[PDB]
Design a protein around this ligand. Sequence first.
Ligand code: NDP
Ligand code: NDP
Ligand code: CL
Ligand code: CL
Lengths: 316, 316
Amino acid sequence: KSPVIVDLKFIPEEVEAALAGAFPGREVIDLADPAHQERDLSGIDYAVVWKSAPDLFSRAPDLKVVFSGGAGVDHVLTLPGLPDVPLVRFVDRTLTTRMSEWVMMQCLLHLRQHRAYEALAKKHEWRDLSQPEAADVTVGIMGMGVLGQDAARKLAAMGFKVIGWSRSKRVIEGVETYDAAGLDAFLGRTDFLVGLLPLTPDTRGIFNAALFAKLSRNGPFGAPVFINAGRGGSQVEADILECLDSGVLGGASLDVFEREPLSPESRFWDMPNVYVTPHVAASSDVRALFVHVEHQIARFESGLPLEHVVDKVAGY
Amino acid sequence: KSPVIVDLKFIPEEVEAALAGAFPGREVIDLADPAHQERDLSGIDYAVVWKSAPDLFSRAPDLKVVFSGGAGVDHVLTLPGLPDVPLVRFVDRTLTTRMSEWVMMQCLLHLRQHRAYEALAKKHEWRDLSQPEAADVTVGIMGMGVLGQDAARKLAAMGFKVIGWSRSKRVIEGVETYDAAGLDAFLGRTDFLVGLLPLTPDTRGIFNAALFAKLSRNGPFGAPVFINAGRGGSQVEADILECLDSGVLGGASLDVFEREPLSPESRFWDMPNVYVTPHVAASSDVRALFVHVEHQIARFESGLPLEHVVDKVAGY
Ligand SMILES: NC(=O)C1=CN([C@@H]2O[C@H](COP(=O)(O)OP(=O)(O)OC[C@H]3O[C@@H](n4cnc5c(N)ncnc54)[C@H](OP(=O)(O)O)[C@@H]3O)[C@@H](O)[C@H]2O)C=CC1
Ligand SMILES: NC(=O)C1=CN([C@@H]2O[C@H](COP(=O)(O)OP(=O)(O)OC[C@H]3O[C@@H](n4cnc5c(N)ncnc54)[C@H](OP(=O)(O)O)[C@@H]3O)[C@@H](O)[C@H]2O)C=CC1
Ligand SMILES: [Cl-]
Ligand SMILES: [Cl-]
């Protein structure tokens, strides 16, 4: 049976733990192990990859299916020699549920004025603030795919008003959606903007000052919030900073950045209404990843269509 | 028609705003207005009260129904001269939904290691941490009433394992519940303990070091968390502090305190894994409060039973 190459820049202890009993009957070649640094990888059919080294595909020229370790494929699409074979992205209940946790947390942190209450606590000052309920806030989600839909449904269940935007219009109970041409109408209703878009050439720099200026000022805080857990390349950080400084944006939650890891010299670390997380909104459960890859391999070898195959021209 | 006395120690601008068009056809006597400081209040049937002055019931001896401005009645039950007539507590979708927001926020803040990521951000340090999903954590809620049930259902929908405890066993889909005698079994399964109990003589000092020592150490963080938004008198703050210092408790979210407002000299303000909020977990929407009171008055005057009447002997 073909081995499976594992080249995942994840927390090493998590990958190592998941290797036990993974891919039964196949050799598993974990490229984090120095013992494998010279192994020729010709004749091997499958690789599971995340932030892999530039030479990987020259070493493994006979791959039949490439599996991303994440939902996003904007990096793997750039790897030199990426083979002309199906590229399968990671889609799984574990990833989806994790993203929705992070999105819900940000919407609650902003709704419930967490930074204000923390500033009061720093002064040892007890002060109750006037407080809207979730239903007083419209959360607008750009990207109505696997992650956007789950987050929308969960936010609505917690009481937020929720609307969605994507290229085509999606039909979702309890969530009004807009297609591409509806962007401006969607923005004008949105108090908390949530980004769950892939990075593609068409989404590069989409979150910019002109867009933030179209967000609603009619909500309970009088100024919108920007929350991004898609990709950093979709935002213009110079504009985010300008808009936070001026008050065009009242706050932000950023999990993703134009250049990661985020520079230690970035202003974002110290800003009073910005929450920074280090690209952890939805971690890949490595056990679940390997179960997913196993399942797709079994489909492939039985002559069934692969699931979650990306359109390389579209970039997602 | 009888006037309605309003004596609510809430944010004044909120009460004032809600007075417009409230109680149509009745004089509304807002005791926050100095113009009313000498008004005799005999012959008046209804009062809506929160943190009211010790002399209120000597001024208003002819009340037929007393309405609490909150869900909790432990303070109003202590007011001198509280009349021997029905005491109606506040129960409303707005209050419930607000509590569930706060409970969800705390469970997510603790699950998602928010304080760790904030400490990293303070150092301008990008570091991903190993991260459990919600389903890896058991949230145990003490108090399975209006607030406890709603919070349990919402937490379960976001992926947490949820169990509940109260005096009698409650039947709730997707949430295993325990009765009084099941407390120890319940505690031993609980990673995040959430308090949503009233203060009564039987719940005074219930959250103490012996109880925290029975919480699970088998969860993903190896140490339990304590979250209280019931009443401060149910907890022993000396024990909370001892247990945080020793690591018996890994963290806490406290909305309520033994003596409020919380002393500026309290250690809780500066502790690295304690979130302090100033008794704001579920604010009373004053408009909704007045609609509720109006509805109960109409029932009363039509000969229908009042709803949400407290048992003064039980204290809730
Ligand atoms: N921060 C983190 O830890 C993580 C980040 N992510 C990011 O989240 C992204 C979304 O994942 P997922 O929901 O699974 O992806 P999906 O492919 O399921 O959804 C993508 C959505 O974006 C929309 N879209 C794409 N391009 C455009 C465009 N030009 N204009 C308008 N809408 C557009 C799609 O529209 P349509 O339906 O019309 O095609 C679709 O609704 C990933 O690509 C990845 O970058 C994912 C996991 C973790
Ligand atoms: N922090 C904040 O902003 C707010 C705090 N609160 C607090 O939340 C409390 C709960 O409100 P709500 O859910 O509406 O009240 P409910 O009366 O609906 O529920 C109370 C629950 O506590 C249980 N209980 C009471 N005494 C005991 C006991 N000795 N042992 C075990 N279980 C007990 C009851 O059990 P049983 O069902 O068997 O009677 C019931 O499940 C309020 O009393 C108030 O103090 C409320 C609003 C806002
Ligand atoms: Cl800011
Ligand atoms: Cl602490």
